Symmetry: D5
Subunit: 197 residues, 10 copies
């Protein structure tokens, strides 16, 4: 309804200062050519749902990396606030040491380009975007602010997109690694349907 995030088209380009390994660094979409990217927006540092999503993705960061997928978090806060929050203990609502980059969208350019800026408050909705290794947007998930996202579902979707890319079959509702897939033509699809009904 706003922005440039269109499924099946080049994901909107982005460039931002990020906190990586406790220091500041530039991060560009072009750095991830050939890898999947999970780009997740959250509204505000030092709030409530947001730490739980950042910590859960960070904790699972290596599961995504094994599949060749990089997880990036972003909010409109600055890298200085991000680092203050990292340097805050998890028992006190902080992030502690982090295993994924935290990008600063201080100009709001990323949130606008991805169509997730809550304009009346100046903060990003809980938008998550899956981008494949060719740079194409494959998936858009946007939650209203009071409800966190699911790292498990994000991982399922990355796995499913990579599987369909690699084999040319399509993934049924609720597919997980090991589940049956469907050959996408009228005749061959009957192998799946005869078995599952």
């Amino acid at each position: 309804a706003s922005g440039n995030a269109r499924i099946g088209k080049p994901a909107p380009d982005f460039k931002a200062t990020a906190v990586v390994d406790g220091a500041f660094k530039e991060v560009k979409l072009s750095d991830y050519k050939g890898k999947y990217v999970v780009l997740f927006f959250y509204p505000l540092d030092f709030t409530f749902v947001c730490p739980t999503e950042i910590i859960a993705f960070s904790n699972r960061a290596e599961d995504f990396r094994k599949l060749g997928c990089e997880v990036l978090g972003v909010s409109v806060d600055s890298q200085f606030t991000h680092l203050a929050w990292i340097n805050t203990p998890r028992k006190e609502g902080g992030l502690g040491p982090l295993n994924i980059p935290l990008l600063a969208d201080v100009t709001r350019r990323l949130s606008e380009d991805y169509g997730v800026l809550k304009t009346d408050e100046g903060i990003a909705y809980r938008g998550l975007f899956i981008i494949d290794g060719k740079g194409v947007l494959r998936q858009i998930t946007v939650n209203d602010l009071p409800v966190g996202r699911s790292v498990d579902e994000a991982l399922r979707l990355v796995q499913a997109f990579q599987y369909t890319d690699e084999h040319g079959e399509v993934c049924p509702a609720g597919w997980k690694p090991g589940s049956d897939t469907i050959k996408p033509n009228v005749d061959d699809s009957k192998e799946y349907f005869s078995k599952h009904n």
Copy 2:
């Protein structure tokens, strides 16, 4: 973020002819005021991922209705095609009997209003929208065509939004029934952060 579909605003109204219990009936969003609605778009009748999503949501329709949530499926196909697909056995790639309405968006107004029309093919992307009982859009999920959605995650999200609606706490990453929630102010949030770190 979807055409006129904006989180936190009234979801775009819709009116459509639907197949309901093997017969044709008009269905309107206003019919569901006071109830949650899961509205899911799918690209094409008589294809491959789409039946698996329609059947999965149909099979679990009652779980959503036990929560006061109605599930509605939508594609650009006509009601006559829908019915022909309902009348095709599941083993042959049909839908068989269905326990959810199947809306016909032959004018494409619904797909355009929700921002999910893949214009170059004239079909809807795999867009799912969660609308609360006040008619406000709370959640947007959109998949590229080869990967089906998760009925479980749809259910988790509806459970989560209903839980935050009633209790005024917020749901952390991965929340499900039985999970702790956070009191969204700085002092009261500490109860959650100390317990879980």
Copy 3:
């Protein structure tokens, strides 16, 4: 009143996926250079006048091909629905095997370009167009939805346009093969008028 179909001008170009001998194939107007084309739109797969028209044209298709004329059927339904309709027995309202292509106009571009889209429903009127081997539109017929067309009249019109094309005489009202024609100049036309009156 809408669209680009103008008698005496190049017919609106079209390209569409079609069902041809039970398989999917791209069909485009340029495939027919040097042949007459009868392009007929119908509103909806799995309805009632439409199969009778499609079957009547399919059954006479060779009568057109002997004249070097190709008959093409088109609706806004997808090729998957077309195929399910072809695989439905005629006794049950299906098409059965067909001897003409059935084009899928899912984007509605063909129906818009030919001015036959019934916008408030998103379906094509019963528009039939006759295009000569030069690619020029020669005839427009458009019926409201409840009244089928006549295959006999379409064939007569093709015959008449081919005859005037080759001989430079003009075809009176009601002309069929074997009927007298008029030499369209003031002096030579008296041969017809004085004979037939």
Copy 4:
């Protein structure tokens, strides 16, 4: 599809001077409320296909009148020229006495409103329009100039539209008085399909 001519909408209003029983009289669409109207345009008085069409319709005008349908011809020529042509013997290419009104469209307003003006010559294409007793346009037929229309088919179409008007069944391809019709709903149409296949 023609200028303001849209199937299923009110037919473009018209008012013209006509020759009626050898005298001048104004003719307007509103005169024919409660009756069907067949309005046929032709390009030029004192030419070749046109007299054969006007004569054929005039000869058969009572076959339309018995059905409550009025036939009206129209070209851009003036009523004075129409009267001259009526006063010319048919053996010399004239019309002789006529049993239908011949309208003068010297301003070209009718031709423009019905979308049949051939602009590079300033004459009407051979457009025929069937309007019902409620003034709604039901049918459009336009031929290129060298090929005359069929009075049989016009009559069949008038008969078809009146039959579906009165009985709410639909007319298959090639329908003629006495042929079977289809009840346009999924269950009741099976009567037709099983009997005819």
Copy 5:
């Protein structure tokens, strides 16, 4: 007030099918380079003032031709109507054989370009235009419909414009061949003024 007819400027180009000696022939303004042209428009074939004007000019056509002036008549009627009118005896309101071309302005371009189209009826006013041998418009005469023009006055004007062209003197009011002219400078003009007052 409308059109492009401007005294002292190149007359608007025209190209028309005409009846010439009972046959059809293209006539273009450029055909007349080096000759004067009297182009007279009239409203309608088979009316009342029009034939008397056409016949009056046709009867006097050789008086203009002897001067190197060609007379051309034009109305919005077609060449087929013109010929029919020529083939009608003068006693019955016809033209009989004509000694001038009669141009068909069926597209109304000539009438619009000379600014004489009566828009509410689609017919030309009684406009007459004198064009010199360089193709420059010299004179505009336009009458309302009920009053015919004067061939005598049109001849006088052609003679006067040729006289001034050749001799560079100017023609007083009512000048006719044989009358005194004025040398158009202050001193030499007194030759005229002293004599006639």
Copy 6:
């Protein structure tokens, strides 16, 4: 056809200071309601054709007034120049005493509104305009500068419009008082055509 001068429509309004019987007086078109008006424009006081037309109209002014027609002359020169020219003897190229008003169009509004301003010189062409007693323009005559008009033809046209106004017959080519007219309907016109051919 001149600026705002449209035959059949109210003549463009005008008001001007004029010389009338050697004094300055306001003249307005509304002064002549109920009377015919001949309005003639000429380019320049103290030139060559102009005095001959002014004197000729002045000399005949009573022939026009006996018909209830008022003759008005106009140029772009001021009333002081008009008066000086009236005070110049005709033997010297002056006007001498005048029997018609001479309007001063110093703003050029009259010439512009009547479409006769020769813009590259700022002077009016020899435009003459016949306006009826309803204020409706009936006739437009415009000569290039070197050739004077005919007062006899102006009088004939006034006589003819008044004759057709009062009797409802139309005036053939070259009609003068005493000449036959035509009854402008098909049947009654035969009286003239058979008498005169």
Copy 7:
């Protein structure tokens, strides 16, 4: 407030037919390169203040020409009216023989370009313009109609501009040949201020 006459900028270019020594001649601003020009407009030939201004300037024309300044008079009247007025005795309000050109601004271009047209009457105000030998406008004087200008003041201004041009001193209020001037710098102007106060 209108036009293009701007002090310190090139005077608006002009070209006009003029009466010069009793004959017609083209006069253009570029003819006066290197000379001063006093260009004076007046409203109307054959009026009252204007002859007195024209005669005054003509009587003094040699005083200006001794200084290398050319005087030009202009009104909207034509050259024929100018000559008629020159040929009128001064005792009767005429100009008699003149020693300055009288330009005819019949298109009003000069008056519009110099911003002196009184639009409601179509005549020039009493505007006088001093142009130096480089073509730059130095002075603008405009009087309402009832009050004539002063030739002595125009002469004083020409002398003053020429003196400042040549000496680069500035001319105090009321300066005339022989009067002191001011050296326009702070230090050197004290020579003047101490002497005269």
Copy 8:
């Protein structure tokens, strides 16, 4: 001709702070109803021509006041700068004591409304304006910067406009008190013309 300054129309209103007998005071055009006003712009305080003009007008202010005319000087300088210049001795380039108001136009609205702003320096040209007791602009004088105006000519024009106001005669070139005027009609003007030639 001056921005909004149009001869014969109400002079542009103005309101300004002014130095008046060495104190600050608001001065507005409406203060002078029923009195003539000579409003003169000059470019800059503490320059060279300007003080001679200001002083010359001040010295003659009672001369203008005995005629009911108020003189006002104006520049873009502030009232504080005006007062410093008044408090500067005349021998030093100052104004000494003054008998006329000195208006400050530091917004440049007066200079822009009177069309005398030299835009590339931000200072007024030497524009003088004569406004009559009814508020109507009668006279515009503008000098380029190096040449002062003439107080005697300003007084002459004030006298002349008051004389024509009072008596309804017009003032010939060079008119002063004691000179004859002209009765502005053709017949009474002969008294002046015969007497002075």
Copy 9:
């Protein structure tokens, strides 16, 4: 000079969530009617110059409040970040307990309305604004990012504006309490200039 910030006019209104004594509260400009406000923007929480300014104003807060002036800081960071910074010890670059409100401009509306947003970074320049008890902006100070402001000067300016508000005298360069002021009129100002020079 800042976005909507114009000296002498009502300061741009603002409303924002702020940290006030360790808790969140809405702060609006209307809260301070009848009091002076020093509104200072800074670019980023958890950076370097910014904490020194915030602490310096916090430490001096009561000096301002004693004069009836309220000091307000603002940055684009959220109130959660502000509170985390306040809860950070000054020795680590935190703010510690603060005596002044810290406003959150997460929408950037305040920074835009005050014209201080550094667009390419999305952060506010070091803009300081002094607003009087009537809500009128009296002072704008904007620093580039590397250079902090002076609290001593802000206080001096508040005192200076308050003094001039009460006593209607004006404050020289470098005025501090106890310093002489100037009576702003020509005569009474000499008291000051003679004393101090």
Copy 10:
């Protein structure tokens, strides 16, 4: 809020005649490349705050020059007014001899480009601008009219900007030469924060 003065971008260029050492001279921004420039606007010569500001900056001009910074004053007054004010004793409210250029902004271009024109009075606000050797605007200070600026603070700011320019550390609140600066990065800034708290 108006004009082009943007911190961190090239300062608006300027050109102007100034008084320098008692004489007139052109000054332009490009003259000061490689030097800091303090450009201060003031509203009016011969007023009250302004001289005290100009004298204070002139008295301390060598303090700035030693630092490679040039102080320039500017008001809308002309250079002749400036020189007169400079020639007025300071005891009289004059400037006396001056050690800084005073620029004349008579066209108001400088005040508009720097956005400090008080448009309703046409005079500059007390805007001061600090520009670095690269021409980049570094500081903006604008006071309402009744309060003078502080030369001490202007100098402190020049000193601060020069210091950060050369060393790349940032200047805390109130920094004066010899005060500690901050290294602008997270870790190195700790040296300052631990020392000073």
